[PDB]
């Protein structure tokens, strides 16, 4: 995440969607336990989650956005 | 904000000869962050761009502020 | 990509941001049809090959530090 | 120098944390043709008395985000 200006307050990042990915079986262990087979990303939703340590009142809240990966 | 707003105090010797301070305060609000994704649908090998509009994440006015991913 | 350094003179720091640039290649035919025995220009625009702002640079095969060369 | 080409050398590492170390400025440690041109003599504690107002000091941070890979050499 890179701030657009010196004091703009807007952060931008980017990356490229892969054809395959490896699912996490159990998130309650460190390190995570991974599945044994790759899966296509097509037909799965993609989401980003941001955690604001300080909202308009100075309290912790989490916000997000979603989108769909498609194929032809 | 309000009674807790940061205030600068300056002790002063007045023209009437009595010592009377002068002061100013300014509120320091916090901001609700939003996160967004540039498109509603992506396809394989499409560039996906993430933006976060949180003014509170700017910690320096001279330098670009950067946040990086953890690999541990 | 995305990481930076900070250089300071006169108590005003400046970031040195590292980034990549999208390239564009385009053959430019002088008239409607490219016929036998006519030179037409080929133009590449990639800021990643401009590694010196005070010098003009050539895409020489023989130099290992030129990472990309056009080919037909 | 009004007649010559002036050369200055800086210690700029702002993360050298050794107790003895300080960011400093030196005058004519080299020439304009990259020769010796003399020894290096401290100016850090005298810059206040030579009319320097926040304008005689160079500092550098090679890895700003402490990612482990230094950006500048």
Burial of A36-64, coded b for 16+ CB within 10 Å and e otherwise, reads eeeeebeeeeeebebebebbeeeeeeebe
CB A53 within 8 A of CB A60: yes
Contacts of A2 in chain C (CB under 8 A): 2, 17
Q: Residue C6: closest CA among chain B residues belongs to which residue?
A: B63
Tokens of B15: 């023209």
Q: Does B47 contact chain C (CB < 8 Å)?
A: no
Using DSSP's 3-state secondary structure scheme, residue D6 falls into: coil
Q: What would the 3-class secondary structure string for A3-69 be?
A: ECCCCCCEEEEEEECCCEECCEEECCCCCCEECCCCEECCCCEEEEEEEECCCCCCCCEEEEEEEEE
* Residue D54 neighbours by CB distance under 10 Å: 10
Q: What is the DSSP letter of C33?
A: S
A11:B61 CB<8 A: no
Angle B40-B45-B46 (CA atoms, 0-180°, nearest 5)? Answer: 35
Distance between CA atoms of residues C26 and C42, nearest Å: 6
């Amino acid at each position: 995440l890179v701030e657009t200006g010196a004091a703009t307050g807007v952060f931008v990042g980017d990356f490229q969607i892969p054809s395959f990915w490896c699912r996490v079986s159990d998130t309650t262990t460190t390190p995570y336990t991974y599945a044994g087979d790759e899966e296509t990303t097509t037909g799965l939703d993609i989401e980003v989650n941001y955690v604001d340590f300080r909202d308009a009142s100075g309290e912790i809240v989490e916000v997000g956005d979603s989108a769909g990966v498609r194929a032809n | 904000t309000d009674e807790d707003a940061p205030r600068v105090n300056y002790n002063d010797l007045g023209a009437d000869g009595v010592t009377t301070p002068v002061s100013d305060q300014e509120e320091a609000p916090s901001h609700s962050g939003v996160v967004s994704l540039n498109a509603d649908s992506y396809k394989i090998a499409d560039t996906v761009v993430i933006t976060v509009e949180d003014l509170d994440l700017n910690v320096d006015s001279d330098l670009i502020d950067i946040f990086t991913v953890v690999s541990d | 990509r995305g990481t930076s350094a900070s250089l300071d003179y006169n108590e005003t720091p400046q970031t040195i941001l590292v980034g990549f640039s999208f390239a564009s290649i385009d053959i430019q035919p002088v008239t409607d049809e490219w016929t036998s025995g006519q030179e037409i220009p080929v133009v590449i625009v990639d800021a990643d090959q401009n590694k010196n702002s005070r010098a003009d640079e050539d895409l020489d095969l023989n130099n290992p530090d030129v990472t990309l060369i056009p080919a037909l | 120098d009004p007649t010559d080409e002036d050369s200055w050398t800086f210690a700029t590492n702002t993360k050298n944390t050794t107790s003895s170390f300080n960011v400093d400025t030196f005058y004519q440690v080299f020439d304009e043709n990259g020769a010796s041109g003399g020894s290096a003599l401290t100016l850090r504690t005298t810059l206040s008395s030579l009319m320097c107002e926040d304008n005689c000091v160079l500092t550098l941070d090679v890895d700003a985000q402490s990612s482990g890979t230094p950006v500048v050499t």
